């Protein structure tokens, strides 16, 4: 693709760039270039790909959610206005989705079956569970909510094996599973249990931690609490 | 209004 | 172009749902596509043209602002990083100048020309000024300037005779064309003269106004007296 | 530093 004739380096130099100047398209750009160029990925490179591609898409669900609401107005003693908000809310959600599948085919092609390591396999199969939420979010699907409901379960599986329960990875993963069993799967039983329980054994093992990995654990198990008093 | 990991 | 087969109405209804979601490069080209049908645009209209590319080009500026900074600083004791900074510069810089150029073509084919109401031809020669202002910032420059300057004072000169000195767009293009002088043009006296002078007679004419009028002028006022607490 | 017409 376009990125094809820049250094892997340089890419990774211009996505943190971009990050900086909050051009997050340019930089899933470049991170994309970078994962083609088929070396694995550090966990700062991770990170980077992660936070260029949850930017973009978290703009694109903002503004679906946005035009999704006003086209169910519109179908309520609602005044016809014609096709356009259907059409204006289908093309956003084309863009989106185009933008789940392309980070689904990174992950596949090939981040996944090279990544050995907990960290890094943990990583990219919350990710696949992720993209795959997002697809289900505007999904009208079943077989898109199981391929998100595996990604997400191998992942626990592996992270309960391989890490602990403080680890910020892990954490993230029960967060983020939770939020799938309660606004996607009609779960929100196993949300709420998942929830207390991940956050239950994180504080259990806090005291193993120093002062910089005890600010990184608990921030997120505050998400997890917070959620937690959304749902209860 | 579930709260996911940040974008960071 | 790619909108030429959708209705003028539509564009129109499809620029205000992009605006409601955010969508500002889609809002944009939706009004481009809108100007195109070539027909005049109604006061509403104007607008929706405005915001949407104010916006495009306002995340420009601000992207290209960010990266001027970093790689001002990597010319300083500073170690060298190579070409990235400069390229990632330049191709944000290409970007900002093409919607300004896309901007000025609008504008000259053929929406000026057909513009005979004050109220019209004024906003769109401050729309000329603005994007030229916005091409003299990165611009390396003295004839951008001079069309920034043109632009400005043909539209100065028309609102002066046809408007009152409350008019918003009236107070806006003065507002404007004193950041001109302030950050562009290298003569501060000018730019405090000018917003000094457009304050006091448009505080003398708030008398005239209804509730409504006098709370759009005076919001508008109110950025012309900041700006003169910020120069002098 | 200087404030322009708002966007809107
Ligand atoms: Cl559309
Ligand atoms: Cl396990
Ligand atoms: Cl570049
Ligand atoms: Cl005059
Ligand atoms: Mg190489
Ligand atoms: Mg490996
Ligand atoms: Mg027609
Ligand atoms: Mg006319």
């Known amino acids: ?232 | 209004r579930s709260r996911s990991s940040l974008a960071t």
């Open chain 1, 1 to 232: 693709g376009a990125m094809g004739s820049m250094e892997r380096a340089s890419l990774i130099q211009k996505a943190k760039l971009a990050e900086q100047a909050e051009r997050y398209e340019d930089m899933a750009a470049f991170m994309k270039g970078a994962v083609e160029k088929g070396e694995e990925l550090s966990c700062e490179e991770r990170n980077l790909l992660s936070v260029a591609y949850k930017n973009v898409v978290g703009g694109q669900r903002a503004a679906w959610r946005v035009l999704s609401s006003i086209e169910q107005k519109s179908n309520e003693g609602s005044e016809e206005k014609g096709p356009e908000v259907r059409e204006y809310r289908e093309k956003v959600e084309t863009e989106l989705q185009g933008v789940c599948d392309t980070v689904l085919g990174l992950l596949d092609s090939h981040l996944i079956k090279e990544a050995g390591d907990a960290e890094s396999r943990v990583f990219y199969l919350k990710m696949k569970g992720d993209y795959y939420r997002y697809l289900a979010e505007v999904a009208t699907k079943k077989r898109i909510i199981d391929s998100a409901r595996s990604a997400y379960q191998e992942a626990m599986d592996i992270s309960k094996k391989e890490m602990p329960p403080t680890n910020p990875i892990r954490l993230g993963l029960a967060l983020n599973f939770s939020v799938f069993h309660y606004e996607i799967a009609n779960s929100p039983e196993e949300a709420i249990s998942l929830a207390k329980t991940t956050f239950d054994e994180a504080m259990a093992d806090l005291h193993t931690l120093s002062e910089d990995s005890y600010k990184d654990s608990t921030l997120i198990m505050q998400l997890l609490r917070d959620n937690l008093t959304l749902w209860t």
